[PDB]
């Protein structure tokens, strides 16, 4: 292996840059990173400048780690505040403390001295995520395979370039002139990157992206998969890639990682109970997680010999990213927005549109229609409060379909506040179908929220919220109807517990059904919102329907236009996707017309050349 | 697979009439073929096969079981007894694709007999089916070398037809339908045409040309996922014989392609001529050689000629029909019928929508067309060219005169104008020297009279005493005269020897008879560059023999297409040419149209 020889060259380079007294054992490419192993980690914990002075002269991302838990936990517990938990990752120990300042750098220095492990102290989450813990245990149980997969991915990233050609192009494999099954191929002569691989949203659930075409098969030709955010319509078929023999990395933000596992296991579990087609088994979710490499916002990451990736805040859901790809030594820069919201919301900061360079933007277009404004945050809230207030005060209960992550959380923040300020009546807000576990995960990723929510996490711990995922518990809400609010899955009524709630509450006109975001073509929710009163399960709906389209987590028409208009630098092309046909085409020609930027709607199975 | 062929056999045997038997059933290329020891019975009742074909939706030919076929040498002797000595048979060729023997006779009626009597007696005795043809005036050495090569390789040939055949008749496997076109070269440029037409079941490559311009080594983007692995390619279609459309077809074989190449019969012959010449000249001049001659052989073993108007299943869901393009001998417009009427797309290749000295106008009538992919060489708003009659008078008046030309294309139309001019006395007289395979190319025209228009057909000009071929001792000997010489845009060949020596005397003229592409020496000169060689030598442009539709003609072609297409796409022109023509069709004719870009894929359905 002539890659060993570039790692030796790197070892020796490093060794003559190191200060006296500091040694390393080995140097390895592990995923995106160059990793230095050391028998003296304390020395790197004390002087953070070595890694600075090292990365500097090497022009790359470098981590150090200890040369290779139950005795560590015990040695730490003597040496060290009210510690909730520990997690031994990279030779780090995460410590959860109610008072984190008391554990931190004199004392952190003394702790590393005695135990070697590097302490990362974190404030004890108000809520326990059972998913975060299961993933951590699963990663420990699979450390050997994981290290080996990182080595393989690493060496492939640092293979040498072999074409004397330069070009860049994007092929669409789903998510064009439709909402659903987003999946795109960015390719160069050296590299093929897959952005997203979603499930369909609409009439037919089985429909996948066009994965069987020469541009994607054989899957081993794929350098990486990027997941822009955790929504099923963007990650849901990533495990199918593995089923079909993909063996590279999946890159996403840390919260995406956690949500993706949650939503995936739930997808296939619900699919079994409801009796639909099950695209992959749970073993493929495990395989996807073993190949997942999280990256934080703003962390520039070599994912291929000629491609650097940087994630930025998208403002859509927890961990949602805008994906910037820097190709070559400044050959081209392309941004895939994923789903985004160019506006500060209760949970997140606005989508980012400042980049060192951007020649091409591929943007979503969900509210892309000329018509498609959505009410201001403040007005949407008052509207929700009034619909819910009125429903309760007259003895009805308010069913609000939602996704586990996305529309549910913003709705909860509004409700808790409203009840707290005596603006909706004190009444139980039931939460069904993984909403609550999804919310727990937010607590574990404070850095992915905006400043105000960060300081607050406390809304989500209100007495009002009552979770339910027991089926036995569901029936008690049903058998004793009693004025309340129900957030329940799934967000477009194509299935899930919201259908049980609906099957039983749709008859009394006193009740209300609250749509808080768009409902896509072909969905049950969409069909209801069009004033169909006969819904197949066949039972007739007399219940009030209100639409308070303020919590979708997407940029409205104005915001889509402002995002591109105010982008720095200004891009030379934009392409549109993730909207119904008219939405993509309307937004595209609007941007050409108003902003004079050449823009056009993508079509599934077309390939466009960027350079 | 044998088992599905038995199921066909046993099936056909159930419906054959009493007395009629078959031995074997094979897919050979696009056809299902029934072998029989009693061919006479199929010659008498044509209703047997014609019905079976229409029943199974597929072309069917019957052929004699080899066990009832005489050897060629005994067939030659049996024919020579049976036929009158003054029939004067020049040659024989025993086609192994069809169990037919082509007999070339000076007097063809004598070999056929009174009402076919003698042709009947010959088949009776030799099994082979005689197709008699009038002996071509010029002798094509290429045509003869190809025929001999096919005989020497009969076993591999039959086996390649079997393999290609079984692949064509594989069953469909997708529940999806779509069509799309990927461009791999020839977009916003002249040169290295190569397009991929694809469906969920099929991938078809149309053309695979060499570059024309500054850099000769430049190929189409053949190394991308849509083309590798090359076994995924069902078929290669070669629209016409020009190097900028077929010249790298043998590179495909070098890189492991093993399916068919489909083109017209004259294209086949011209392609082999021009390819062997390409690599031979590249050796002598000292440029990069992309493949060896062995790859031209391999290509020819895989070539399957189709005549115009022959509807041909090339894939489980694609039927192909060639039609006259009007550009050069054998040039085709390619119509692809996808599915059971899912979509129809025409690739025009290079074409000319006007009757010329040699050819009829490009065809633009089809049963259906939803998409047209058209050339755009003279696509600029500016790019009219003079009338045939006016072009001729101009050439006559201008006309030592060096005229760069391609082996096939510009050279032949020029030759017809010159011989006539000299004969009538428009230019008094001169030896018209012909260098670099022009003459051999012209011989090939004589072998394909059906691919010419009516008037030239009746005429076969080319045997005038004036024309003097030359291909190194002759070169050196070259006194007032005319020189047609290769290559047509001055990127190399003997015309550079002629030029290296005649460029100094201002007395001499350099005649450009067709466009010169970006990056060529001819283009540089044609722009009035005088430098390196000092270039005081008259330059005249008589742009009337390119063999392409001018701007008016391009527009007329689409404007009168029946049916009207829903989209057109443009290619094969310099950037401004492709974009200009596109938006001109959108504006004038209201048909959505746009120029293609290399490496983009467009979805048709
Ligand atoms: Zn989303
Ligand atoms: Zn989405
Ligand atoms: Zn041509
Ligand atoms: Zn051409």
Swiss-Prot record, chain A:
KHa as annotated region, ranges: 4-68
InterPro entries hit by this protein: aCPSF1 (IPR019975), Beta_Casp (IPR022712), KH_dom (IPR004087), KH_dom-like_a/b (IPR015946), KH_dom_type_2 (IPR004044), KH_sf_prok-type (IPR009019), MBL (IPR050698), Metallo-B-lactamas (IPR001279)
GO biological process: DNA-templated transcription termination
EC category name: hydrolase
Molecular function per GO: DNA binding; exonuclease activity; identical protein binding; RNA binding; RNA endonuclease activity; zinc ion binding
Residues reported in the UniProt entry to bind Zn(2+) 1: 229, 231, 316, 339
Binding site for Zn(2+) 2: 233-234, 339, 578
Keywords annotated in UniProt: DNA-binding, Endonuclease, Exonuclease, Hydrolase, Metal-binding, Nuclease, RNA-binding, Transcription, Transcription regulation, Transcription termination, Zinc
Cofactor field: Zn(2+)
Positions of region (KHb): 69-126
Entry-linked HAMAP family: FttA
The protein's assembly and partners: Homodimer. Interacts with RNA polymerase (RNAP), interacts with the Spt4-Spt5 complex.
UniProt similarity note: Belongs to the metallo-beta-lactamase superfamily. RNA-metabolizing metallo-beta-lactamase-like family. FttA subfamily.
NCBIfam families recorded: arCOG00543
The protein, known as: Transcription termination factor FttA
Organism the protein comes from: Methanosarcina mazei (strain ATCC BAA-159 / DSM 3647 / Goe1 / Go1 / JCM 11833 / OCM 88)
Gene: fttA
